[PDB]
């Protein structure tokens, strides 16, 4: 028999300084932090796909109900939730003809097909950005489904319709959002099916993407992304301590250059003067040779940490007092040897390793419900288990489907209070602005860092990319 | 096809499902032997689906 300690559920902050555990309910009752007068939205896609977007936007203007309001809070309408105007009147439409789509689509080379399909959209988006009076906060890219069928790696275009670049990744989303980094255009890609899905049917007659019971949460998670990409602060953390920079470091491969070259990317969060939280990327991507080393050379590590420390000085004035570098991988000694050199005396540097590999699964003896979210089996002063995915009573269910697995957290080097470490990662699990859910299973640093790494490794010609997450998610 | 009172090998349409485990011994937290859960399906109860 070993004790399990439970971490108090962290609370996120909303308008008027009011705290609420759930983000959906917090926005539903209190609204967002800052007043965004209106979302002047631009939409690009087929004229058939414009009608779908207009219908969906008018639909989310009205309140939307889920099947079970206890498990999923209902959507009270966009402008009521967000105090922001987002109508289908006033959308700048850039038509993309179906013939031009089929001209690129029916090509044998998947790389060239993806490159041409992305180029067709980005050229029109950039032309509208540069040569049009209209100002667009965010560009909603409404893509058809045959594209998504035949615009990603390992997708075989059938012989019957094949009617007829290699420096760019074949992911439509990744390479698409990678080519707009020079122009800093916030975009939101929608599948045509993710939109009014009731049109798309299968052979049996039930829609392939059935969101009938979960239409309200679909509205919640689309609306939140649209609001964030337009420059809004949906919610904020309240338990963050003063002077703690976090940084989330993830390694992604690059298939274009010979040897994957293991590109590294970082995402940073700290507190700002006042009470505002600064959650921006720390992107200086530091390439590391060798196939699978995943340990940065001293020069790259020093450059990364110096950029992290300067990006804190220029916003607060002085160095963080406690930096908590998270990472999916444990570091070698050379990396801390690099870090400590630029690391000053007052700043305390701690490296934290988080892993989903270890297969521990606490089954409850009675009942068809999983363990409570927050339980933490502390192995010792340095290593611990944390159940970020699990049951929480407010949503009435668990965030997992089967019995979930916890997060293996350990302090490689540095000292760190392990309880404090578990008390901050659980806070990090709530700031997922790309999704309007109760909480995330992994800390947002390691997930948004992974996203920006997946975006930056799609194009080879990136230089001084934006740090804002609205250009990435 | 059931030990104790609970089934371990069952039927799903034409596929017979089986409860399976995988073994792994670890010594870091304690000397322990970790067990995982898997489900595999067979068309005749003897040959796995390839």
């Amino acid at each position: 028999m070993k004790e399990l300690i439970y971490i108090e559920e962290p609370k996120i902050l909303f308008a008027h300084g009011q705290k609420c555990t759930d983000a959906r309910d917090g926005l539903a009752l209190f609204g967002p932090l800052n007043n965004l007068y209106g979302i002047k939205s631009g939409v690009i896609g087929t004229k058939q796909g414009l009608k779908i977007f207009r219908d969906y936007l008018d639909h989310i203007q009205k309140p939307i109900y889920n099947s079970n309001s206890i498990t999923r809070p209902m959507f009270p309408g966009f402008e009521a939730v967000f105090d922001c105007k987002w109508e289908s009147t006033g959308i700048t439409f850039k038509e993309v003809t179906n013939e031009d789509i089929g001209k690129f689509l029916y090509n044998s080379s998947t790389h060239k097909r993806t490159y041409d399909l992305v180029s067709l959209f980005i050229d029109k988006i950039i032309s509208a950005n540069k040569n049009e009076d209209e100002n667009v906060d965010v560009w909603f890219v409404i893509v058809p489904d045959e594209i998504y069928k035949y615009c990603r790696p390992n997708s075989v275009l059938p012989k019957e319709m094949v009617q007829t670049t290699y420096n760019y990744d074949a992911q439509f989303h990744d390479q698409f959002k990678a080519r707009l980094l020079k122009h800093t255009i916030p975009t939101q890609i929608f599948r045509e099916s993710t939109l009014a899905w009731r049109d798309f049917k299968n052979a049996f007659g039930l829609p392939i993407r059935d969101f009938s019971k979960i239409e309200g949460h679909l509205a919640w998670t689309i609306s939140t992304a649209a609001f964030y990409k337009a420059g809004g602060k949906p919610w904020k953390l309240s338990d963050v301590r003063n002077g703690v920079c976090y940084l989330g470091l993830v390694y992604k491969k690059v298939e274009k250059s010979k040897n994957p070259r293991n590109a590294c990317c970082a995402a940073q969060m700290f507190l700002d003067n006042g009470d505002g939280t600064v959650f921006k990327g720390e992107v200086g991507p530091w390439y590391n040779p060798k196939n699978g080393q995943y340990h940065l050379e001293p020069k790259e590590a020093k450059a990364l940490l110096s950029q992290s420390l300067q990006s804190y000085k220029e916003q607060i004035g002085e160095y963080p007092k406690e930096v908590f570098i998270h990472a999916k991988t444990r570091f070698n000694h050379q990396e801390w040897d690099a870090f400590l050199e630029v690391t000053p005396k007052e700043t305390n540097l701690v490296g934290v390793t988080i892993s989903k590999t270890k297969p521990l699964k606490l089954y409850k003896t009675e009942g068809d419900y999983t363990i409570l979210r927050g339980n933490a089996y502390v192995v010792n002063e340095r290593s611990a288990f944390l159940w970020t995915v699990g049951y929480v009573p407010k949503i009435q269910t668990a965030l997992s489907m089967e019995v979930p697995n916890p997060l293996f957290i350990e302090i490689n080097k540095g000292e760190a209070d392990i309880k404090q470490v578990l008390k901050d990662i659980l806070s990090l699990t709530k700031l997922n602005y790309n999704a309007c859910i109760f909480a995330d299973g992994e800390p947002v640093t390691l997930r948004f860092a992974d996203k920006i790494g997946e975006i930056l490794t799609a194009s080879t010609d990136i230089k001084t990319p934006p740090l804002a997450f609205k250009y990435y998610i | 096809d059931k030990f104790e009172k609970t089934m371990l090998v069952g039927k799903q349409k034409d596929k017979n499902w089986h409860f399976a485990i995988s073994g792994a011994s670890k010594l870091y937290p304690f000397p322990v032997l970790m067990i995982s859960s898997h489900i595999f399906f067979t068309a005749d109860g003897k040959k796995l689906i390839d």
């Binding site: 028999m1 070993k2 439970y6 009942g367 409570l372 339980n375 009573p393 | 032997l33």
Partner: peptide
């Protein structure tokens, strides 16, 4: 190897 799995202890519960 023990035939009964390692049992843990949580001070926090809930009900359906």
């Amino acid at each position: 190897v023990s035939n009964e799995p390692v049992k843990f202890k949580g001070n926090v519960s809930y009900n359906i």
